[PDB]
Amino acid sequence: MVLYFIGLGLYDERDITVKGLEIAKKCDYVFAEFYTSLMAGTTLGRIQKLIGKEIRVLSREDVELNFENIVLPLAKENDVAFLTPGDPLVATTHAELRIRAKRAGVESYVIHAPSIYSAVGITGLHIYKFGKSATVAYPEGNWFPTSYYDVIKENAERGLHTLLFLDIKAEKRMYMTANEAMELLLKVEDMKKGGVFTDDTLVVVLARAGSLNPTIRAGYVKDLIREDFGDPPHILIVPGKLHIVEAEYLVEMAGAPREILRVNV
Amino acid sequence: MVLYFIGLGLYDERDITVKGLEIAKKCDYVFAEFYTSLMAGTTLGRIQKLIGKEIRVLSREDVELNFENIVLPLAKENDVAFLTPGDPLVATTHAELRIRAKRAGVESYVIHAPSIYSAVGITGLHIYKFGKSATVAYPEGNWFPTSYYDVIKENAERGLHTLLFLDIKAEKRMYMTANEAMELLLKVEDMKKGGVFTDDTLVVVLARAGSLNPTIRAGYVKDLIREDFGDPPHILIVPGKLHIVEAEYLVEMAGAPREILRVNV
Ligand SMILES: Nc1ncnc2c1ncn2[C@@H]1O[C@H](CSCC[C@H](N)C(=O)O)[C@@H](O)[C@H]1O
Ligand code: NA
């Protein structure tokens, strides 16, 4: 009788850790959610096949409102696993679900998996240099979110990089591309005019991290805004002050304009 | 003709991903490094047995100075793997190794694995709230480094959390404990007197992330500075102002004193 929060990784069913696979294989019941992120290189079938279990997929409402009514009950008698894309507790509210488990008298364990948060390391940007992170959310109705713009500004002022998670509307199957994120940011810049995100701003795009051939592109907004970066998911990064070796990597590995080699110190 | 940068994950031999293990088993040669960090929950022998391949260990110099003469030559006509604790490319200087590969006409692919950068999410602290990261280094001779102190200050000042890596002497297998890190910071506070780290500062200690039984403790320095957090490696975090949900998780899961629910929120 226990509950396991098991991450599935970045792209496909093989991104799960060996620890996660072996424990997942021996659980009595297996639940999962696929709304907090997109695993573009797999399907539910391949996942079930790999674990050898039927996986009951839950909606955001099932989780946020009925986790303790659907999942916890079975944990009191059996070994249950709750699967999620990437790492279970990263850029989600899943951590709080452990508190519900405790209050229900259920012990929980966390099995980590590759996360986009550390995968950004493949962009060549020093991970210790990333500042506060933010999410570019789709405007809805008359409400136009802009907080993420202020985050970039705050980090940029300190010479730190900014990781931008992109919005997702799972039930509509809508995944925000880096192109859309860029369009929204220019509109915010037009509104606030803080000189934070313009046509000349250098940005980095990472698409489908975890796959063997992710798309990694670095360049000025004016040139990348209409570029095709392949299928989702995508994340956008606005680097801060670059180190020489970071610039070198962007140019050699991400096709960045050879001119960024000339870092203003 | 291919070089695979493969992450080994957080704690033991099972923290590597299914993708990483399968790829490693198919490589003709397998290298690894344990100078940036060590897999405290396993041994080289256990990792070798799992991959079913002989593993040649490389020192810091072998990598930084001779990567192209030791690893890349074999990658010209064979499939080669380079194993590192955590997620590949997280360690600052590793990204540059891909440039060396390109230069040698060698293709390289990155196989991600859990990293402490994302695993700290188990402390209940929101990932988006972490700011710049830093390493607490031991002072020595006439050298008393204190930059990590300024990092905490600049992050906390903006309501951001600070992830602190502790000094490690891989070769001599000597680890800096969280207790030691705290003592150093108190000593640094006495010199800079910026009111950044004192007996009343709330801190979180994460030990053996990745194991099924990690140590997660949150509390004020005056009460934790002499507490035993167990075997290394330890990770220290100086949280910024907490979201009530973060505070609740620390109280319920990390034994934090109820006091933080009013003092640090
Ligand atoms: N493989 C991948 N490549 C690019 N972006 C990714 C990605 N996986 C997740 N993301 C990004 O992160 C968002 C989900 S946020 C949830 C993240 C997850 N817990 C983790 O640990 O990675 C997506 O909308 C997308 O913008
Ligand atoms: Na960070």
CA of A76 from ligand 2 middle (Å) equals 36
A&B contacts, CB < 8 Å = 176
H helix or E strand, kind and range, residue B50: helix B44-51
Burial of B261 (0-12, 13-18, 19+ CB in 10 A): middle
d(CA B83, CA B117): 18
First to last CA, chain B: 54
B257 contacts: CB under 8 Å, gap ≥ 6: B219, B220, B223, B251
Sequence-distant (≥ 6) Cβ neighbours of residue B35 within 8 angstroms: B59, B60, B63, B170, B171
Burial profile B121-145: b = 16 or more Cβ within 10 angstroms, e = fewer: bbbbbbbbbbbbbbbbbbeeeeeee
CB count in 10 Å sphere of residue B79: 17
Whole-angstrom Cα distance, residue A186 to residue A251?
A: 24
Grouping H, G, I as helix, E, B as strand and the rest as coil, residue A30 is strand
**Rounded-to-integer distance, Cα B234 and Cα B217, Å:** 11
Resolution value, angstrom units: 2.2
What's the CA gap between B21 and B34, in Å, rounded? 18
Beta strands per DSSP E along chain A: 2-7, 29-33, 55-58, 79-84, 108-111, 134-136, 162-166, 168-169, 174-175, 202-207, 215-220, 234-238
Closest CA to B197 of B176, B224, B169: B224
Write out residues 44-73 of A within 8 Å (CB-CB) of B.
50
For A62-214, strand residue ranges (E) read 79-84, 108-111, 134-136, 162-166, 168-169, 174-175, 202-207
Q: Does B88 touch chain A (CB under 8 A)?
A: yes
Q: Which two tokens stand for residue B212?
A: 């099924």
Distance CA B184, CA A33 (A): 43
Q: How many CB atoms lie within 10 A of CB A166?
A: 21
Mutate to test the interface with A, among B12, B100, B132 (most CBs of A within 10 A): B132
Does B17 contact A at CB distance below 8 Å? yes
Cα B123 to Cα A98: distance, rounded to the nearest angstrom: 11
A90 is in an annotated binding site: yes
Please say whether the dihedral angle defined by the alpha carbons of residues A75, A81, A85 and A86, taken in this order, is positive or negative.
positive
Look at the domain B1-114 and name its fold.
Answer: Cobalt-precorrin-4 Transmethylase; domain 1 (3.40.1010)
Distance between CA atoms of residues B133 and A131, nearest Å: 8
- CA end-to-end span of chain A, whole Å? 57
Helix, strand or coil for residue A4? strand
Which positions in chain A touch B90 (Cβ < 8 Å)?
A: 118, 121, 127
Cα angle, residue B95 at apex, residues B93 and B101 outer, rounded to 5°: 115
Minimal-distance CA residue of chain B relative to A87: B118
- CATH fold of A115-265 reads 3.30.950
Instruction: Annotate A99-118 with b (16+ C-beta within 10 A) or e (fewer).
Output: bebeebebebbbbbbbbbbb
Contact B95 A122 (CB under 8 A): yes
Asked if residue A237 lies in contact with residue A254, where contact means CB atoms within 8 angstroms, the answer is: no
Q: How far is the CA of A9 from the centre of ligand 1 (A)?
A: 9
CB-based contact B178:B236 (threshold 8 Å): yes
Give the Å distances, CA to CA, from A135 to A60, A184, A198, B241.
Answer: 18, 12, 18, 20
Interface check B253 vs A, CB under 8 A: yes
* B12 interfaces chain A, CB cutoff of 8 Å: yes
> Cα A40 to the chain's mean position, in Å?
12
Any CB–CB contact under 8 A between A186 and chain B?
no
- Contact partners, residue A124, CB within 8 Å, separation at least 6: A245, A246, A248, A249, A250, A253, A254, B95, B98
Domain with CATH 3.30.950.10 in chain B: 115-265
The span from the CA of A240 to the CA of A202, in Å, is 9
Dihedral sign for Cα A16, A17, A20, A25, please.
positive
- Host H or E run for residue B188: helix B178-192
Sheet-wide strand order for B56-58 = B56-58, B29-33, B79-84, B2-7, B107-111
Determine the residue among A64, A127, A150 to mutate to test chain B binding: the one whose Cβ has the most chain B Cβ atoms within 10 Å.
Answer: A127
Going by their DSSP bridges, the two strands B29-33 and B79-84 should be labelled as parallel
CATH 3.40.1010.10 spans which residues of chain A?
Answer: 1-114
- Which amino acid type is present at position A27? C
Evaluate whether B229 touches B215 at the Cβ level (below 8 Å): yes
On the 0-12 / 13-18 / 19+ scale of CB atoms within 10 A, B226 is exposed
Where does residue A233 rank: exposed (0-12), middle (13-18), buried (19+ CB within 10 A)? buried
Ligand nearest to the CA of A119: 1
